[PDB]
Amino acid sequence: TVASISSGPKHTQKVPILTANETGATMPVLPSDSIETRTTYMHFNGSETDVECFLGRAACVHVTEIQNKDATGIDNHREAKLFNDWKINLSSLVQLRKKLELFTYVRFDSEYTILATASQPDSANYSSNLVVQAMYVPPGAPNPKEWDDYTWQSASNPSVFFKVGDTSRFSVPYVGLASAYNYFYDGYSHDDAETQYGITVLNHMGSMAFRIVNEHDEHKTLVKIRVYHRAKHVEAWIPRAPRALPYTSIGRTNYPKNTEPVIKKRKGDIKSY
Amino acid sequence: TVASISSGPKHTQKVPILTANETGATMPVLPSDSIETRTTYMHFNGSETDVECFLGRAACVHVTEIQNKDATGIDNHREAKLFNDWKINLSSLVQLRKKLELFTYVRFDSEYTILATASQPDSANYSSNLVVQAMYVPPGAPNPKEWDDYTWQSASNPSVFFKVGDTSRFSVPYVGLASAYNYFYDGYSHDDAETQYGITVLNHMGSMAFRIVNEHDEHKTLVKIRVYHRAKHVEAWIPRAPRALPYTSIGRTNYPKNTEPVIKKRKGDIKSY
Amino acid sequence: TVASISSGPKHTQKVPILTANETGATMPVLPSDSIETRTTYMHFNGSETDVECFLGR
Amino acid sequence: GYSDRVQQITLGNSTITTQEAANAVVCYAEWPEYLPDVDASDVNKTSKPDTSVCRFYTLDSKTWTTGSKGWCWKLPDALKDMGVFGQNMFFHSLGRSGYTVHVQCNATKFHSGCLLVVVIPEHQLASHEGGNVSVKYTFTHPGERGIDLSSANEVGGPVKDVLYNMNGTLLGNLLIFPHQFINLRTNNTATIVIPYINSVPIDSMTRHNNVSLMVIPIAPLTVPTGATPSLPITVTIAPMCTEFSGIRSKSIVPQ
Amino acid sequence: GLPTTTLPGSGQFLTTDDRQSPSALPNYEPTPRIHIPGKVHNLLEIIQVDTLIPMNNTHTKDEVNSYLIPLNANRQNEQVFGTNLFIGDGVFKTTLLGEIVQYYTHWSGSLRFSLMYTGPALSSAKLILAYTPPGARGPQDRREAMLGTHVVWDIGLQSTIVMTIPWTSGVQFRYTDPDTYTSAGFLSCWYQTSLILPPETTGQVYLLSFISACPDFKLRLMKDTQTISQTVALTE
Amino acid sequence: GLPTTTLPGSGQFLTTDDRQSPSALPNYEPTPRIHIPGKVHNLLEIIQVDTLIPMNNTH
Amino acid sequence: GLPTTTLPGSGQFLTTDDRQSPSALPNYEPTPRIHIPGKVHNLLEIIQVDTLIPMNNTH
Amino acid sequence: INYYKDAASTSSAGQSLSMDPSKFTEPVKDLMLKGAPALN
Amino acid sequence: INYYKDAASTSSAGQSLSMDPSKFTEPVKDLMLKGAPALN
Amino acid sequence: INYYKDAASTSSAGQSLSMDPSKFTEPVKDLMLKGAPALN
């Protein structure tokens, strides 16, 4: 492939460099339209800018935490972090979010990796070996109420059991209700006067509940869960302007008030170098 | 292959042993040009002197250390070794360095092995099990500021998570900007009167940041990281004189003052055996 | 596979929507027996409702 | 003698002529078309009023003055009240449509000024409150009036800051969306053909707008000496290939 | 039982590796795809669309005005604007090009810089745009500027001028984050003759300026952008 | 000895995965199947039989 | 699931072994090679060039 | 590839792709045609 | 070799090697030729 | 068998078995024959 062809002096009536940008086109002008060039080859394919590659590496999408401790006398397991749920999202930690929102609709399978590490902040004789249970709870399933409810039987709901310190990995097909996922949606769920705007139910990728299967030892053990997400089989439509201001909320476009100028001011003139 | 052919008495006008070294050549003289020889075969190929073999074994290129401890009240994580970076180099530990600098330009893929072991120098009930995170931070990426920054999300930057005591291994393609790497460069980055000499930006192999993912236990744990590097697919041009004096700095040729004579003095005469 | 065929106005002596449930049958009535439909395809096989799948986790 | 410059668009019972055009943009290089069966889901036969809905409606005019910040209309909202297009809209459960948008602004060879005319698929607005305040319905359904970016923040309304496109992105990058400029010195109209863009084959026309049309002054209007300091901008829009499905009782929407 | 040996790296999680995994939802059937205009396949497809450069960066809070380069009637010989070419920083940084370049470590290729004139139709002007390849200082006067890559632009019916910064380089890749060795030059613009307004007209006229990449362009070695960060996880 | 590398997920138990296992009862012979009317293959087969709706829910 | 047995040496790191590894930079394209005079392939090539011997070591 | 000798040890079965609701939805002795009168 | 039955479980896809910027860079209705005048 | 997609991930290269010291041992412009006089 040639990156530049050889081109010499020109004295024409045919001027490729004068255009009318009002038309909305970006005319494909090249170095050889306005200087004299020599042949050179590309030596490159643009492999690593493919959208599959761009969205295809694992990104941290969520960090939560649960603890193993005596539940005796706990009136609210959920509240003691005896167990914890997470409604899956890709817009809570901003790194991956800005990447996805370069597109309007996106379609992909997900590969999740879940790393779990334990901490024992206060005096323990040892490090126990805990098994985590991660249950995938689709909308309409009973939700866990205690850390050892009938729910955890999970007879119809996919669940994975792995050890703290290890990693769990599985992949979920594209679960969207429509043909793609809208990280933007300029609509409502119905024509209600007060219903929420923008956040919709066609960007729901399910939800996940974590708990330790082990009963309690004498000390307490903090287990912190990190969920990583990798898109595989990516398809993206309609590019948009990149995010400039900071994010404030999952699912709305809102930016913070009295934010700071995002364009760097010159130290000098327009004329400055 | 014959290592020596059979050759007998000679009384010629054709003298292969008289030459003129002023010409710059090393004339290919053999035993059979000046004594009577018998046939013998080589029985050998020179396999283990191939440059791929010479530069192809893992060498320790870096030892760093980070600790897991309560960051509560630490004003400078980087400074507490709560996390640590390393700008990749092959010229800080001298063993591999002398080997590479036998050549002027070198091109190869790298295979990294990272061994991490833990130490608990002061009273602990136990040994905790820590997961290390090694992030590859190319120039221009946000650099970690705390041990748990948004940076560690590493949504676009390759990172590996492995356990202390284990080893991590991955391989990076030749990331040089030019066609080869110059471990020598008799130039500057620009014609500045005070810019640095010799150290250039086309020997940059990236940079790497390490941290423990675990929160803190009651005791403190020292984790010491050793990075090993193995060249694979090696290509080397222009041999040079081997390094004689000791090294003083990454990237400059400078030797120490009042160094010692590097040639061993005879215990005796020129005539001595 | 078609999920619905195209069907237009009807003025018949042949009424598929009147039945006698006392018989014990569930007559296979479709949208196209009582409204005007357009063609659409199924795009689906019913894979995940197989009893092997239902009892297989 | 055809110029890129003169054009005629006849759609239904209405025709537009421009003698000073700058080509026309067809979003994503695709022209509006009806919904194919292979893509269909709802089993209902759809209704295609054709020429009674696919004609040109001219919205009420705006006034560009030196202080203007820009205006924003949403589709199909802007047309919610135009003739039979609008009736069909409130009466069917689902509908689908593409449009021809023609923005008009003429001046003289002594004026200067340049407007950006852009179509943004799925333009989800931001609340000026920050945090996770929502933007109430009424605020994102201004109707033919559209939203006036130089009007004041209101409560439950969107933010109207132009350097941020009403969503946290910079004005400068709106050029990645199908768009055309109106530069008084060149141009006097902008025309964009919009194919139907959605993640579902057909949708509700009232709970979801699928494009915002935005006209933004970028090089300020500068009139000749002692000229009146303003020009009107007119927007005429025509639904094209419209289909409605799931007819019934007639939606009732807030406010 | 087949004998195996495990190698160094066993059990590691590398966020960039690509392997198979069990599906959690065995036998599930995804929604059919329908057609949607606009599919993107390569980021290289989109960085060829031009977007506006806030060249007039001299303000103090972001404003529509930093997109406008002003022009003065009747000035002769003088300089319209200047900038270095660190596409990952400074004016370029918020543009779509700048914004994507920042996801990669290295770039190589030609850039296309165009200027669209917005002055009254009855005015006229001749400007010179100059590209100065690495190695010299930003030009200080047109004489200096005109000795490097340049285009005399004659303002006419055809409203825009497209200047190309042809790839001039020893090393075949440059860093996107500004680096010296790897630096790309300067871009300046001067009056060639001068802007002239018709009667009954007055004041400043402005140029809009765009940037996009030529088909020439290469970007490699993905990394994280300095353009976005956060201090606590967001919630709904 | 063939060189291997284990990936993330090793040792996990996913209730939905489908793999082979050793039989605890090697060589055992199950009872022959006889014919039984009524075999169900898909839940889609049965949701087409109609059943009564307690529409008058007001009690 | 295929039955395996691991041998002695599993998990060891031998600095001299030569195996495959995942690339951290999937799909990256290295700079083209250009021609450079002087390529060395074997150390045996270079030890045939003669160099001076500090024979007079007595200093 | 089965690694094991017994049939019980193989993975899950594969979709019936049988599907015939008529034993449940139309177990009538004399065949009913849709469109013809239910009771003649 | 896929070891798993479902398509979601396969590795990353392979390069589009599609690439056609014209839907984004030249969505004009009447074709513009480089070198010919923009507005006739 | 390569298990990985990228070339960097393959094992060590295999012996040049190239070997030609003459660029280093005899870079003279006019060819010298062993046995013939060095300087004529």
UniProtKB/Swiss-Prot annotation, chain E:
Transmembrane segments: none annotated. It is found in: Virion; Host cytoplasm. Interacts with capsid protein VP0 and capsid protein VP1 to form heterotrimeric protomers. Five protomers subsequently associate to form pentamers which serve as building blocks for the capsid. Interacts with capsid protein VP4 in the mature capsid. Interacts with protein 2C; this interaction may be important for virion morphogenesis. Forms an icosahedral capsid of pseudo T=3 symmetry with capsid proteins VP2 and VP3. The capsid is 300 Angstroms in diameter, composed of 60 copies of each capsid protein and enclosing the viral positive strand RNA genome. This is Capsid protein VP3. It comes from Human rhinovirus 14 (HRV-14). The chain holds residues 332 to 567 of 2179 of the full protein.
